[PDB]
């Protein structure tokens, strides 16, 4: 008796999972011949390549637990194997007598490298590998091919290409396993009945004092519930315009499906279908790029450019990226990182990020503009790294793609348009309710100066119980001065990149 193995990495769902469904149908179409091991490998190597904050660890813990629970309802279970794939797979290929290995493809460089080696090993041991592109709606390889070898670098061109592509068929959940016994304990399982159990919170989250509120629980089950909840107002869905949603509403102004789509607890292809059904029902609706389908296409767009550039997350050796002289300033980077810049709007956002792990799209605009071309002149690679740690929806391609945009390094080139850290939030939150929440030490400043507390006289600062320089920092820079200087810096950079 040989085993069929589905390998989870992303695609942490049961629904719309061709690679997992295939394993399950195979076992039921040939009962008595196959054991079924759906695994997730706790890979220590990813930590040398990416940073993970406490809140995102918790999300994953919650995801794996839900995935295990959902697998049990199909007479299976999640096997969480600790260890490196390069050492894990030779062992289990033998100990398990693995006939077939399936998994969802991924375009990230670490994934590509790791997957190539696993496929070299699988080819040696005579293991059949079947891969599926289901993490995105479109296959970046096919998009690039259709565009004659190059990723479209504008959204409109990208849209014109995928319009001509076949939308894939969205699968349901696999059928339950018919008459399958529990796989026999292997070398590891016999010395430890729990060697493959889902990790506890204690095991994954080493810094639990950094956990913020539990608002967006992980797992395919919460993902589908949140999707259904977001689709209940079909008018809000059909008339969604992303630029008109607020960054600083106390309640999220968008769906906050990003963490779910990032881990694949929600199939983007299912989400897209559910959106097409509402658009069809609602004749007055928005169109890309501002619509919600448009939002999913921004995801697809950035996955496609990133599939073409292994260096997508850095400035050097990145085909798309303007080379800019970003300066090193540790102290300003620390202040930004910890929301101690002295600009209440920026600080409020960066504290919401660190506490909760999600901030609105245009709040990320604000704080990223400030770090890079706006104000501090600090490389976008540094904002990407802080974002990588803190974001529940951390996504190699989406994080890099949007930082290059916000920094006018690629895709976006109108660097003369600069967000004001004082003015930008006022449009949607003139009372500063968002600042009061996330910068509580300013909670007693009236609207007139809560965005600019340095316009309050010292006497009033003592009356509101927050003296700048003691209870809340002074501005680490003066926006009105640095942003003008930075525009000239950006113009010089653009000139140099144009002549090379």
Ligand X SMILES: Cc1cc2nc3c(=O)[nH]c(=O)nc-3n(C[C@H](O)[C@H](O)[C@H](O)COP(=O)(O)OP(=O)(O)OC[C@H]3O[C@@H](n4cnc5c(N)ncnc54)[C@H](O)[C@@H]3O)c2cc1C
Nearer Cβ to ligand X (5/305): 305
Interatomic CA distance for residues 356 and 55, integer angstroms: 7
Instruction: Say if residue 405 carries a ligand binding annotation.
Output: no
Give me the least distance between CB of 126 and ligand X, in Å please: 38
Strands 128-132 and 34-42: unpaired
| Helix, strand or coil, per DSSP, at residue 428 | coil
Alpha-carbon distances, residue 120 vs 113, 115, 125, 415, 441 (angstroms): 11, 9, 9, 46, 57
State the residue number with the nearest CB to ligand X: 254
Nearer Cβ to ligand X (174/247): 247
Give me the least distance between CB of 308 and ligand X, in Å please: 16
Give me the least distance between CB of 224 and ligand X, in Å please: 14
Instruction: Say if residue 297 carries a ligand binding annotation.
Output: yes
Instruction: Say if residue 222 carries a ligand binding annotation.
Output: no
Nearer Cβ to ligand X (245/486): 245
Instruction: Say if residue 8 carries a ligand binding annotation.
Output: no
Interatomic CA distance for residues 138 and 143, integer angstroms: 7
Instruction: Say if residue 240 carries a ligand binding annotation.
Output: no
Residue whose entry in the numeric block shows the structure tokens 């965005």? 451
| Torsional sign, CA 207, 210, 215, 216 | negative
Give me the least distance between CB of 393 and ligand X, in Å please: 4
Instruction: Say if residue 364 carries a ligand binding annotation.
Output: yes
Give me the least distance between CB of 294 and ligand X, in Å please: 8
Q: What is the DSSP letter of 472?
A: B
Instruction: Say if residue 394 carries a ligand binding annotation.
Output: yes
Nearer Cβ to ligand X (364/489): 364
Which positions lie near ligand X, rule CB under 6 A? 242, 254-258, 261-262, 295-296, 298-299, 302, 360-361, 364-365, 368, 387, 391, 393-395, 398-399, 402-403, 406
Question: Between 54-72 and 220-230, two packed helices, what is the crossing angle to 10 degrees?
Answer: 100
Instruction: Say if residue 299 carries a ligand binding annotation.
Output: yes
Interatomic CA distance for residues 152 and 140, integer angstroms: 10
Nearer Cβ to ligand X (102/352): 352
Nearer Cβ to ligand X (34/336): 336
Give me the least distance between CB of 422 and ligand X, in Å please: 20
Instruction: Say if residue 395 carries a ligand binding annotation.
Output: yes
Instruction: Say if residue 375 carries a ligand binding annotation.
Output: no
Q: Where are the beta strands (DSSP E) in 187-305?
A: none
Closest CA to 8 of 58, 110, 80: 80
Tally of helices (H runs) and strands (E runs) in the chain: 23, 5
Structure tokens at 74: 């199909």
Nearer Cβ to ligand X (38/401): 401
Give me the least distance between CB of 145 and ligand X, in Å please: 22
Alpha-carbon distances, residue 24 vs 196, 296, 422 (angstroms): 20, 29, 56
Give me the least distance between CB of 228 and ligand X, in Å please: 14
Residue 57 CA, distance from chain mean position: 13
Instruction: Say if residue 91 carries a ligand binding annotation.
Output: no
Interatomic CA distance for residues 368 and 407, integer angstroms: 7
| Residue 332 contacts residue 339 (beta carbons within 8 Å) | no
Give me the least distance between CB of 495 and ligand X, in Å please: 25
Angle among Cα 59, 237, 255 to the nearest 5 degrees reads 15
Structure tokens at 320: 């798309």
| Residue 29 contacts residue 172 (beta carbons within 8 Å) | no
DSSP β-bridge partners for residue 82: 42
Nearer Cβ to ligand X (135/364): 364
| Residue 355 contacts residue 210 (beta carbons within 8 Å) | no
Instruction: Say if residue 358 carries a ligand binding annotation.
Output: yes
Q: Is 72 exposed, middle or buried (0-12, 13-18, 19+ CB in 10 A)?
A: exposed
Interatomic CA distance for residues 35 and 182, integer angstroms: 8
Give me the least distance between CB of 56 and ligand X, in Å please: 11
Instruction: Say if residue 420 carries a ligand binding annotation.
Output: no
Instruction: Say if residue 6 carries a ligand binding annotation.
Output: no
Nearer Cβ to ligand X (67/296): 296
Give me the least distance between CB of 415 and ligand X, in Å please: 15
Nearer Cβ to ligand X (114/262): 262
Nearer Cβ to ligand X (23/261): 261
Question: Between 268-281 and 292-308, two packed helices, what is the crossing angle to 10 degrees?
Answer: 150
Q: Is 228 exposed, middle or buried (0-12, 13-18, 19+ CB in 10 A)?
A: exposed
Could you list the residues known to form a binding site, using ranges: 242, 254-258, 295-302, 358, 361, 364, 393-395, 402
Q: Please state the residue numbers annotated as binding site for FAD.
A: 242, 254-258, 295-302, 358, 361, 364, 393-395, 402
């Amino acid at each position: 008796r040989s085993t069929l193995v589905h390998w989870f990495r992303k695609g942490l769902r049961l629904h719309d999972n061709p690679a997992l469904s295939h394993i399950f149908t195979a076992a039921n179409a040939a009962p008595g011949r196959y054991f079924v091991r759906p695994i997730f490998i706790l890979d220590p190597g990813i930590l040398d390549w990416m940073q993970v904050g406490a809140n995102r660890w918790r999300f994953l813990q919650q995801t794996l637990e839900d995935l295990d629970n959902q697998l049990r309802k199909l007479n299976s279970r999640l096997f969480v194997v600790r260890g490196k794939p390069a050492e894990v797979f030779p062992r289990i290929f033998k100990s398990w007598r693995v006939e077939m290995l399936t998994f969802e493809t991924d375009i990230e460089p670490y994934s590509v490298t790791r997957d190539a080696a696993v496929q070299k090993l699988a080819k040696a041991e005579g293991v059949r590998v079947e891969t599926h592109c289901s993490h995105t709606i479109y296959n970046p390889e096919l998009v690039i091919a259709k565009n004659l070898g190059k990723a479209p670098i504008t959204y409109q061109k990208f849209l014109g290409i995928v319009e001509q592509l076949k939308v894939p068929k969205v699968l349901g959940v696999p059928e339950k396993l018919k008459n399958m016994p529990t796989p026999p304990k292997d070398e590891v399982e016999q010395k430890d009945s729990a060697a493959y159990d889902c990790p506890t919170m204690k095991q994954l989250v080493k810094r639990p004092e950094e956990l913020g509120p539990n608002k967006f629980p992980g797992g395919e089950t919460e993902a589908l519930r949140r999707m259904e909840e977001s689709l209940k107002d079909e008018i809000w869905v059909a008339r969604f315009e992303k630029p008109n949603t607020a960054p600083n509403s106390l309640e999220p102004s968008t769906t906050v499906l990003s963490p779910y789509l990032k881990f694949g607890c929600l199939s983007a292809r299912l989400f897209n279908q559910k959106l097409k059904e509402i658009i069809k029902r609602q004749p007055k609706h928005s169109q890309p790029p501002v619509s919600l389908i448009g939002q999913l296409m921004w995801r697809e767009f950035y996955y496609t450019v990133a599939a073409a550039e292994p260096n997508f997350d850095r400035m050097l050796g990145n085909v798309y990226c303007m080379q800019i002289p970003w300066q090193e300033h540790p102290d300003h980077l620390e202040a930004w990182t910890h929301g101690r810049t002295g600009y209440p709007f920026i600080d409020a956002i960066m504290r919401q990020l660190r506490q909760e792990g999600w901030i609105h799209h245009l709040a990320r605009h604000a704080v990223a503009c400030f770090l890079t071309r706006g104000d501090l002149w600090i490389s976008w690679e540094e904002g990407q790294r802080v974002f990588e740690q803190l974001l529940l929806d951390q996504d190699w391609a989406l994080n890099a793609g949007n930082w290059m945009w916000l920094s006018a390094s690629a895709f976006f080139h109108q660097y003369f348009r600069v967000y004001s850290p004082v003015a930008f939030g006022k449009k949607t939150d003139p009372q500063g309710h968002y600042i009061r929440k996330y910068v509580p030490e300013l909670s007693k400043y009236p609207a007139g100066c809560i965005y600019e507390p340095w316009k309050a006289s010292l006497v009033d600062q003592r009356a509101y119980g927050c003296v700048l320089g003691t209870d809340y920092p002074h501005r680490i820079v003066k926006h009105e001065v640095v942003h003008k200087e930075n525009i000239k810096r950006m113009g010089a950079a653009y000139k140099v990149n144009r002549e090379v």
